Design a protein around this nucleic acid. Structure first.
Ligand SMILES: [Mg+2]
Ligand SMILES: [Mg+2]
Ligand SMILES: [Mg+2]
Ligand SMILES: [Mg+2]
Ligand SMILES: [Mg+2]
Ligand SMILES: [Mg+2]
Ligand SMILES: [Mg+2]
Ligand SMILES: [Mg+2]
Ligand SMILES: [Mg+2]
Ligand SMILES: [Mg+2]
Ligand SMILES: [Mg+2]
Ligand SMILES: [Mg+2]
Ligand SMILES: [Mg+2]
Ligand SMILES: [Mg+2]
Ligand SMILES: [Mg+2]
Ligand SMILES: [Mg+2]
Ligand SMILES: [Mg+2]
Ligand SMILES: [Mg+2]
Ligand SMILES: [Mg+2]
Ligand SMILES: [Mg+2]
Ligand SMILES: [Mg+2]
Ligand SMILES: [Mg+2]
Ligand SMILES: [Mg+2]
Ligand SMILES: [Mg+2]
Ligand SMILES: [Mg+2]
Ligand SMILES: [Mg+2]
Ligand SMILES: [Mg+2]
Ligand SMILES: [Mg+2]
Ligand SMILES: [Mg+2]
Ligand SMILES: [Mg+2]
Ligand SMILES: [Mg+2]
Ligand SMILES: [Mg+2]
Ligand SMILES: [Mg+2]
Ligand SMILES: [Mg+2]
Ligand SMILES: [Mg+2]
Ligand SMILES: [Mg+2]
Ligand SMILES: [Mg+2]
Ligand SMILES: [Mg+2]
Lengths: 179, 339, 393, 122, 210, 46
RNA sequence: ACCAAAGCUAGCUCAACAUACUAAACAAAUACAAAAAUACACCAAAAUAAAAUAAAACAUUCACCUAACAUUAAAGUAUAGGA
RNA sequence: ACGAGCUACCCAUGAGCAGUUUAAAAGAACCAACUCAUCUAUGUGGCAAAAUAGUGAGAAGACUUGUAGGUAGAGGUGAAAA
RNA sequence: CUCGCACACGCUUACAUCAGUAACUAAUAAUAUACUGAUAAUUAACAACCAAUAAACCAAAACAACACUAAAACGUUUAUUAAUUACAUUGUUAACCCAACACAGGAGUGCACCAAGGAAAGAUUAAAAGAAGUAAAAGGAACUCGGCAAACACAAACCCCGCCU
């Protein structure tokens, strides 16, 4: 069963390989979950063959015969992963209602920033964990000057961007007086 | 200089063929041709030998209690190692009355045997020495479970210039693909003793299979013929290394070749299964400059793996193979020629 | 007094509790809700952790009284590495035997007979000495854990070669790392020897009694030597968990029931790791008595009585250069009393098998003053070893 | 003064520094110092039978697409739970206290694959 | 660096030295006991020579007296008596039971505290008088010490008497002991230098008067 | 003798003296990291 | 004749208005030696700003000197100052 | 704020010293590896921001040296040369 | 003519194959381990990662027999519980590192003095001055601050100052 990494031998020496369109999201939504589970491996073997052919075309210094097949396949993979994620997050919104798959908290780190800290799996609680208590989630009083300076810098950047767009609008209006 | 470290106990897939390529030895299935000029020596009592072997089985399987084993997996190394020492000691003691040479022989227990030799040529692919020619060196670091050493040499099975139509398999690949790896340390050629020991010849070797090379582990690894291949590679490595050790404590080397052949016997055991091998070294000139016009070859006769017992339970040995014990007694009954 | 702890190196005491917790009827506000430390909030007090499903590796160790075999009476256990101070005196006291300087006359008659020697005795023993000390290793200077089991196994092979002249040595076998337990009571305290041995020789047939009834009767009025400030307990390990069951390493119906020789190995480089010779003798006395008591209670029963058939167990202790020899005859089970029949023990002490060995040739003033090989040789040690091996036949 | 911009990798450090490349652990260190691999941590790959299954990785060019309607929680409720709830309310057998017959589950920890802890990888 | 001129010495193991002379094994029998001396060895940590003392089920390393040899018998007691005791060189007795002219070592400060003073090699204090249930001794620095009479002390002089007459052959021996050389800075002597004749400081007393 | 070679490289010493963990164990090293972030450094530490 | 030269753009600067203020990306790994899923803990902290200068030196003193309270006047006024 | 990856001194953990003379592994002697740098000549934008060649001193100790940690400037460290 | 082979640390593809070099790198060409482009590569047995809790332990390593002082690194068995179940992860190249350089400098360990590594001269001529080496009649320190340097010598004494290493 090692030949599935390659194409059929009639198609090895052909310069152009025609193929169909990529799988559309609305076409993915009509199928059942077992159909998606089988279609994932059906796409997987073809993508492995296309990557093998791409590497061999890179090796033997010849162009890959119609390399848009890999683009269509990875578009199909993105579509199927997307519709499975719609089914899973919709079903989780019905059952629990939590928006995100991983637990997390909005935290204030030592650097002063606001960070979405995702949680991890541990067999022991948080107060007993040696590694976790030496982490610090708070900001010291000296951090506030740097937090303010970060604010001041991004405020200056957006000020110059707004003035730049205003100047470009002025320059185009003065350049072309079609009004 | 750099050398390949050759392991007799190996996990390689086709290791016997690569070892035959490194060794210039041909493997023949079946026993060597029997020297039928024997006197009426088999007045052997089979019942006492069977009772001794069964007593060793019952001791290290049922009777001798260990410290309590909490993994409960019952690792066969600690089970079958003193089984092999007791089997070798008991069979030597019971067969010393028939073979007086075994009384004057010495017994080694877990004492290493080393051999170093050159084979073939190689052009260096990389480095500042690229394009130059440097020979391939090999080192065998082997630790036999038991050894028997004799002051006098065992007799030959076949003559020195005896030719076989089968020819040495040549692999068209680098030795790194086995896998084997180059390592540098001291070059030792060891018999199991130093030179001043008067017993520069031997009788037999005994080799226990480790835990990683078990038949159950191979069947989990999806390995059918590897059971025979591992035993083959172990015999071809160990017996060749030890016969080369005999030849180079006897003063023979690459440009002296070998005057009269070196003959050895080997017993390779998994915890249930026994295998019997014979080796004859004629070639010690494995250097490529001396191997252009060298017609002679080394020979390794092999025996297919056969179990000794079967499903031992509650002081009763259910199955027993008498032919394995007979082959072991015929191996232990070999004597040097007298004059 | 002077306590042996240090305030810095000890684990610190917990920080003193926040003053919110000392207010009755007040709920403290802590950082437990945000599951991380926060300055300005009180430190929460958590209950001790209870893993409802148990894990084997990661749980706390169970206490010693939780074990089913835990008993209130502290038993004193002797294992392989326990040392005794007045080793011969403590061995004689805790074993209740009598010490004899020579080996028995049967052993000397077996040794001194010229028909019992091997073909070229001195040549084979000197070659065995050279093989153990220099030849068997790739290195120029082999270590003691290498050369001591090699010289022991080589001497066993040398005395095993006599089986063609004496076809009664096939009734023996060697055994390794067995579990031995022998528990008894000796003057209101509970003793137990328990552990393993190096290599133990067993046989189908028992060894014949070696001491005469005149010696047994003269042993009766012998008084045991006593020593006041050290208790005879000292050197043993106190244990509160044990089983009162005499356990030899072999189960019922074993074809080789009677041990004939024990072998004791001192395989270590450093001087503090190896036993002193008195400690080595004490170890062989108490282990040989453990094997003999296992024999004399397995064949007779748990009742304590004098033995009409003595039990003889031999042992050899080995340093690699200097040997100790023991023949121990057990006659008495009821060791609670101090007035009854005492057992017997013959000990040859500090038999030097060779004086010194030279692995490399020493050169003084550009000439060789001493050649390679062992200096000094005493074959009487090998003769005693051969008699101890050939004592069955 | 070394390379700060280069990523810190196990190839760079000494023999002491050994860092994984992102793989998942499959066992632990056993009694003898060897590695004991746990079969339970091994990802058992789940494959169907594709011989008797008819589908192809590419779609016909003449096959039309559809108006893109993403899957919504309201649409999933109206398609799955709403006929049962409407039928039970018109039959009078609707129970506000117990909703387990309509597909609702109160606590996730009973079942094998949880959603909010995300027990299943993929 | 807080103490100068220390470092670069030989590797030394530390011996656990038991300072409390009267230490019963169990509290069931608090009576006086008698132990046996096995060996006397050199200790690299102190100037004295130590001795291994075994009794019951335990051994202790103690500070050896002048003529303590291998295989000796040493009595430890707390019993005070009005006929006193006949003091040998090994025995440990309270200061109330000793005769007036007794030479002592390893003097305990507070009852139950343990031996702190007179520990160096060859140094011995002398009991002076016993008044009102209180012992007064004279230290090797010729200072009087007032102590409760129930404090245990060991009779005799500490071993290795010729430690004061031990000669150091070279600076290499100082570096072996671990004493780094002094600094090369030339410091002019102040007013602190000179031969100061001072009267003897008064008796240091650890008996707490209520 | 000859100079110019005061830098003898060692990754253990480098990551122990100028590492991220060593920077964050001290408030001064934390302020060093905030100054490098305010300047906009590509590499905050080793 | 080589070397050279010339562009008008990228973009900044100062304000005003203004929401109300640490942007974007977070699928995984990130304070083990950062970007390494996985084990019995410890965690944390504050104490006046000083001086270069001016007083032609320099000791008491020396406006602003990282503490929101703005403008027109009172007013450079009363006061405080090696006055 | 940052610096003891060079150097000054310590705490750990290791590794080297062949031959020769002597009862000696004696801070003895000859002389290698090894460690310093006495003297001279080149070099002086050089091979080199301190080197090369010849010659020298120690070479079983107060000796070199690998890895790692510690002591930080109103200081550290120093067999004091500021 | 002889600083070789490998490992540890450190560097980071600079390694290997093919093709090109008008120009960029070699302080110059020829071409290529040092430039350019494409493609591949280092496969674990070696090394890292790799159990605690109580207890019997005074007795050096120096060929260690047994000793000296400066008192000396380096683990056993006994009991309690240690998931038990093929194949885990990671380093495997090099002519290489620190010195601004393809620098006569610095650089730890194990075995060797070659069985391995390399090339002082781009081609002429053979002026002065300069560096290095060899040899010299007669004299032998008369040169110079000084027997500095050199030499077929490589010795014997007196002081000063510090005992000495
Ligand atoms: Mg840099
Ligand atoms: Mg690394
Ligand atoms: Mg490396
Ligand atoms: Mg494994
Ligand atoms: Mg000290
Ligand atoms: Mg001392
Ligand atoms: Mg001084
Ligand atoms: Mg001075
Ligand atoms: Mg620099
Ligand atoms: Mg001024
Ligand atoms: Mg001024
Ligand atoms: Mg100011
Ligand atoms: Mg005033
Ligand atoms: Mg440091
Ligand atoms: Mg340092
Ligand atoms: Mg020497
Ligand atoms: Mg010297
Ligand atoms: Mg000298
Ligand atoms: Mg210097
Ligand atoms: Mg020089
Ligand atoms: Mg010259
Ligand atoms: Mg010299
Ligand atoms: Mg200072
Ligand atoms: Mg000065
Ligand atoms: Mg000065
Ligand atoms: Mg570089
Ligand atoms: Mg060029
Ligand atoms: Mg390599
Ligand atoms: Mg030229
Ligand atoms: Mg000239
Ligand atoms: Mg000249
Ligand atoms: Mg000349
Ligand atoms: Mg002349
Ligand atoms: Mg003159
Ligand atoms: Mg000169
Ligand atoms: Mg001269
Ligand atoms: Mg002269
Ligand atoms: Mg001087």
């Amino acid at each position: 069963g090692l030949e599935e990494f390659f194409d059929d031998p009639k198609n090895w020496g052909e310069e152009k390989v025609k193929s169909g369109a990529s799988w559309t999201c609305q076409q993915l939504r009509n199928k059942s979950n077992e159909d998606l589970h089988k279609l994932w491996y059906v796409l997987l073997k073809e993508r492995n063959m296309l990557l093998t052919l791409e590497q061999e075309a890179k090796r033997q210094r010849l162009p890959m015969p119609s390399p848009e097949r890999l683009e269509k396949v990875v578009d199909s993979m993105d579509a199927l992963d997307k519709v499975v994620q719609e089914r899973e997050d919709a079903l989780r919104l019905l059952q629990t209602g939590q928006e995100k798959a991983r637990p997390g908290a909005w935290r204030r780190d030592i650097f002063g920033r606001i960070i979405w800290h995702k949680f991890k799996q541990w067999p022991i609680p948080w107060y007993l964990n040696k590694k976790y208590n030496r982490k610090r989630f708070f900001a010291m009083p000296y951090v506030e000057r740097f937090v303010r300076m970060r604010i001041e810098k991004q405020a200056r950047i957006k000020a110059r961007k707004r003035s730049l767009e205003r100047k470009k609008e002025k320059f185009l209006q003065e350049k072309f007086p079609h009004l | 200089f750099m050398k390949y470290v050759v392991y007799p106990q190996t996990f390689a897939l086709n290791a016997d063929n690569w070892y035959q390529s490194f060794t210039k030895t041909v493997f023949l299935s079946g026993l060597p041709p029997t020297p039928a000029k024997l006197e009426p020596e088999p007045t052997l009592d089979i019942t006492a030998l069977r009772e001794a072997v069964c007593d060793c089985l019952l001791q290290e399987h049922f009777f001798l209690r260990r410290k309590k084993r909490a993994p409960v997996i019952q690792d066969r190394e600690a089970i079958a190692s003193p089984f092999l020492d007791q089997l070798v000691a008991s069979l030597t003691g019971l067969l010393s009355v028939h073979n007086p040479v075994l009384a004057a022989a010495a017994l080694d227990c877990k004492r290493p045997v080393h051999f170093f030799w050159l084979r073939g040529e190689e052009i260096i692919p990389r480095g500042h020495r690229k394009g130059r020619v440097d020979a391939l060196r090999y080192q065998i670091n082997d630790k036999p479970h038991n050894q028997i050493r004799i002051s006098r040499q065992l007799p030959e099975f076949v003559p020195l210039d005896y030719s076989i139509p089968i020819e040495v398999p040549v692999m068209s690949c680098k030795p790194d693909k086995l896998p084997l790896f180059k390592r540098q340390y001291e070059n030792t050629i060891f018999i199991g003793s130093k030179t001043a020991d008067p017993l520069c010849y031997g009788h037999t070797q005994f080799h226990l299979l480790p835990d990683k090379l078990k038949r159950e582990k191979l069947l989990k690894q999806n390995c059918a013929d590897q059971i025979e291949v591992v035993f083959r590679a172990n015999a071809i490595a160990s017996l060749f290394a030890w016969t080369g050790a005999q030849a180079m404590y006897q003063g023979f080397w690459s440009e002296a070749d070998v005057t009269r052949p070196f003959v050895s016997q080997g017993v390779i055991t998994d915890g249930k299964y026994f295998s019997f091998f014979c080796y004859q070294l004629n070639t010690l000139a494995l250097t490529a400059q001396a191997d252009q016009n060298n017609p002679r070859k080394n020979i390794c006769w092999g025996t297919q793996s056969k179990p000794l017992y079967e499903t031992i339970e509650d002081n009763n040995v259910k199955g027993f193979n008498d032919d394995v014990l007979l082959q072991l007694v015929q191996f232990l009954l070999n004597r040097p020629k007298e004059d | 007094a002077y306590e042996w702890g240090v305030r810095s190196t000890r684990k610190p005491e917990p920080p003193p509790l926040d003053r919110v917790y000392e207010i009755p009827g007040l709920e403290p506000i802590t950082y437990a809700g945000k599951m991380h430390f926060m300055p300005g909030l009180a430190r929460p007090v958590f209950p001790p952790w209870d893993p409802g499903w148990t894990h084997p590796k990661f749980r706390r160790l169970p206490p010693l009284h939780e074990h089913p075999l835990y008993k209130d009476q502290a038993c004193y256990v002797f294992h392989q590495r326990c040392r005794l101070l007045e080793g011969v005196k403590q061995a004689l006291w805790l074993t209740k035997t009598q010490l004899i300087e020579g080996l028995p006359e049967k052993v000397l008659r077996l040794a001194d007979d010229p028909r019992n020697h091997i073909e070229n005795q001195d040549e084979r023993v000197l070659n065995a000495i050279s093989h153990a000390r220099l030849w068997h290793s790739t290195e120029d200077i082999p270590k003691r854990e290498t050369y001591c089991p090699v010289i022991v196994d080589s001497l066993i092979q040398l005395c095993k070669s006599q089986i063609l002249k004496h076809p009664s040595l096939a009734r023996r076998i060697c055994a390794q790392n067995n579990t031995l337990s022998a528990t008894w009571n000796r003057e209101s305290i509970l003793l137990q020897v328990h552990g393993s041995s190096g290599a133990r020789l067993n046989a189908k047939d028992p060894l014949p009694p070696v001491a005469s009834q005149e010696e047994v009767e003269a042993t009766k009025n012998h008084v045991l030597e006593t020593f006041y400030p050290i208790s005879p307990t000292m050197g043993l390990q106190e244990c509160n968990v044990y089983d009162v069951n005499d356990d030899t390493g072999f189960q019922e119906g074993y074809p080789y029931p009677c041990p004939h020789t024990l072998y004791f190995l001192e395989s270590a480089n450093l001087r503090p790791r190896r036993f002193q010779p008195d400690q080595l003798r004490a170890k062989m006395i108490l282990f040989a008595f453990g094997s003999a008591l296992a024999q004399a209670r397995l064949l007779y029963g748990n009742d304590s009585k004098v033995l009409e058939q003595p039990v003889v167990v031999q042992s050899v202790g080995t340093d690699g250069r200097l040997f100790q020899f023991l023949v121990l005859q057990l006659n008495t089970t009821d060791l609670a009393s101090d007035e009854g029949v005492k057992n017997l023990a013959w000990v040859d002490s500090d038999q030097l098998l060779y004086q010194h060995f030279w692995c490399l040739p020493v050169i003084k003033k550009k000439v060789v003053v001493e050649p390679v090989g062992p200096i000094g040789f005493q074959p009487e040690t090998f003769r005693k070893f051969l008699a101890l091996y050939l004592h069955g036949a | 003064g070394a390379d700060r911009m280069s990523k810190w990798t196990s190839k760079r450090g000494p023999r002491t520094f050994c860092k994984g490349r992102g793989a998942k652990g499959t066992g632990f260190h056993g009694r003898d110092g060897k590695f004991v691999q746990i079969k339970e941590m091994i990802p058992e790959l789940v494959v169907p039978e594709l011989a008797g299954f008819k589908l192809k990785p590419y779609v016909n060019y003449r096959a039309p697409e559809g108006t893109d309607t993403p899957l919504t929680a309201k649409q999933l409720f109206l398609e799955t739970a709403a006929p049962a709830i409407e039928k039970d309310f018109k039959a009078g057998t609707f129970d506000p206290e117990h909703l387990e017959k309509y597909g609702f589950e109160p606590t996730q920890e009973g079942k094998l694959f949880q959603l909010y802890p995300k027990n299943f990888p993929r | 660096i807080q103490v100068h001129g220390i470092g670069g010495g030989h590797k030394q193991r530390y011996r656990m030295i038991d300072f409390l002379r009267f230490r019963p094994e169990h509290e069931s029998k608090p009576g006086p006991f008698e132990e046996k001396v096995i060996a006397v060895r050199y200790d690299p940590c102190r100037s004295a020579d130590i001795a291994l003392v075994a009794g019951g089920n335990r051994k202790r390393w103690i500070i050896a007296t002048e003529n303590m040899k291998a295989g000796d018998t040493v009595l430890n007691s707390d019993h005070i008596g009005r006929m006193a005791v006949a003091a040998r060189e090994g025995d440990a007795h309270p200061l109330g039971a000793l005769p007036v002219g007794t030479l002592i070592n390893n003097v305990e400060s507070e009852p139950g505290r343990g031996a702190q003073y007179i520990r160096a090699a060859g140094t011995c204090g002398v009991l002076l008088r016993k008044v009102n249930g209180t012992a007064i001794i004279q230290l090797p620095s010729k200072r009087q010490m007032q102590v409760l009479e129930t404090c245990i002390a060991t009779v005799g002089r500490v071993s290795n008497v010729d430690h004061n007459k031990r000669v150091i052959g070279k600076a290499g021996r100082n570096r072996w002991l671990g004493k780094r050389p002094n600094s090369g800075l030339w410091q002019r002597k102040g007013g602190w230098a000179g031969r100061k004749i001072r009267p003897l400081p008064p008796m240091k007393s650890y008996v707490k008067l209520p | 003798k000859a100079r110019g070679n005061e830098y003898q490289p060692s990754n253990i010493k480098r990551k122990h003296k100028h590492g991220w963990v060593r920077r964050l164990r001290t408030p001064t090293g934390v302020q060093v990291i905030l100054r490098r972030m305010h300047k906009g450094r590509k590499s905050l530490s080793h």
